[PDB]
Ligand SMILES: [Cl-]
Ligand SMILES: [Cl-]
């Protein structure tokens with residue numbers, strides 16, 4: 001229908017969005033995490049003005065108008081902001097139809113296999129394998145991702161030999177009955193990445209993520225065509241034209257869009273379409289317990305070319321202190337290695353009234 | 367001293383200035399890109415200052431790369447708009463430390479730069495547009511003029527039926543045969559429609575066709591460039607260096623037009639200038655208002671080896687840019703027979719208005 005108001009409730013780490021249509025119906029979404037306060041300022045300054053009082057039936061076209069009206073601001077922030085209104089609108093639709101978003105998207109509620117994703121690089125290989133082994137046995141995870149090199153470390157490792165050690169260590173401690181994934185986070189050059197690539201293949205890994213600087217498509221494509229193991233990437237890509245370019249030249253084997261970094265469900269679905277047309281699987285990026293993971297769970301239960309599993313961060317409050325207490329009831333309980341999309345209308349989650357009380361509020365209305 | 371001790375911003379919603387201070391106490395003034403400058407300044411302190419404070423600014427290029435790598439999850443305009451403010455303040459500091467205008471620090475010399483009168487309006491009839499530009503031709507001495515075609519990112523639609531068809535011959539008729547005529551479509555057309563418009567431009571001697579197609583569709587722009595004889599230009603919204611490399615490598619345009627502040631500063635703009643230089647392409651930067659962006663461009667144009675034909679010079683008044691009034695103690699934009707001037711004053715050679723600063727929103731970061 002038509003939007004009458006857009007409100008944001010945020011702190012520096014995460015911000016939630018509530019949209020209200022003319023008839024009074026409301027929906028809840030979330031902008032991308034990290035510097036969420038800046039993102040919400042951008043939302044009211046450059047997104048709300050173009051969406052308020054407009055028909056949201058053709059959301060794709062409306063979001064395009066936003067980016068065209070703000071064409072002088074290509075990049076992350078505008079899209080992180082857009083994602084908040086988009087996701088709130090989908091929650092609205094689900095609640096209006098009495099269906100979870102997965103169903104509105106043409107899918108069905110149910111379980112989704114998840115892979116335990118480690119975010120740490122400072123942690124020692126021994127301690128990593130140890131905590132992931134406990135999760136394998138207590139939570140039922142059958143897929144695990146660890147870190148390689150140093151974050152955008154210009155070919156330098158977290159420390160001499162960490163990557164060499166962590167590769168075999170993980171396969172040794174977790175056994176041969178689990179899937180192993182690794183993420184270099186744009187640390188290596190095509191050649192250094194190829195070196196590491198072989199060490200990975202020798203130990204059974206099946207996922208080599210962001211081996212080279214993500215903005216250097218060519219370098220990445222060199223690794224992808226040089227290795228047999230799957231090379232993946234795309235989490236930092238929020239530009240659709242660049243997405244099409246990446247998929248046409250096939251710089252990767254698996255595409256990994258982040259629903260919120262990309263600009264919402266609608267825009268992510270465009271990448272999903274580009275991916276299937278090229279016959280590529282979609283394994284989204286979602287690295288924390290904000291709503292980004294839940295949004296991805298609904299998406300994976302609806303798209304025809306979904307990857308093998310849902311990225312599920314296994315970090316605690318020491319890494320993500322801000323994600324504690326966000327919801328009345330967490331939607332992230334794991335059941336034998338799987339997450340669950342329930343039949344609750346919309347996203348099926350409630351933002352903590354206490355968290356909202358402490359948030360910074362801002363509204364845009366017509 | 368070459369180590370930053372502090373970074374301060376003075377801003378309002380339209381424009382924000384940056385002052386940097388080295389450990390020895392030396393200071394330089396720069397500016398972040400205009401428009402939602404308050405947000406840009408917030409981004410500057412949150413995502414730029416933390417990586418630059420306390421560091422040696424001798425190799426500013428590498429330091430700026432570190433900023434983009436540390437903030438790799440934030441590709442896009444805002445981070446670069448913020449970085450541009452620290453970068454330009456550092457160049458002012460260097461010029462002042464050396465007693466030289468930035469143009470000289472960059473390897474160039476002070477002097478005149480030919481400017482082209484740039485109209486920003488589409489909601490102005492071809493008749494009134496020609497009239498005001500003709501008067502500027504006679505009173506200011508401009509010999510180059512740029513007007514607008516189509517509707518801004520108008521999806522092939524014109525501001526109104528037939529406006530572009532009328533404005534082309536009107537400018538040539540009214541301004542005469544002895545002036546250069548440029549036009550900017552601001553991403554309005556599809557390649558086919560742009561080519562039709564291109565033919566009209568060529569039929570009336572225009573020499574510059576800017577941003578004919580959506581700027582993010584390099585292949586579309588290239589099709590136009592390849593089909594038309596008239597120079598096709600673009601690049602003002604491009605802040606990504608690898609995209610710049612792709613655009614130049616594929617020869618999508620005939621003239622590159624980086625905006626010093628949208629691109630992230632002088633250092634980063636110089637990287638694009640070099641890409642263009644090696645490829646044999648000229649550089650005609652974008653600078654659309656009387657904030658410091660135009661002055662920064664003036665200094666750059668007095669130094670690069672592959673400069674284009676002229677400096678973009680906005681001729682809009684306070685009805686269009688109310689916020690650019692009273693920014694400086696003395697305007698650096700007085701025109702002399704169609705030319706702007708870079709003086710030998712150290713640094714940028716300008717002083718921010720104390721009154722404007724008094725009314726600004728202040729924020730500082732220091733170590
Ligand atoms: Cl941005
Ligand atoms: Cl860049």
Ligand SMILES: [Mg+2]
Nearest residue numbers: 183209210235
């Ligand atoms: Mg990753």
Ligand SMILES: [Mg+2]
Nearest residue numbers: 224225227228
């Ligand atoms: Mg391969």
Ligand SMILES: [Mg+2]
Nearest residue numbers: 550576577602
């Ligand atoms: Mg232009």
Ligand SMILES: [Mg+2]
Nearest residue numbers: 591592594595
């Ligand atoms: Mg040509």
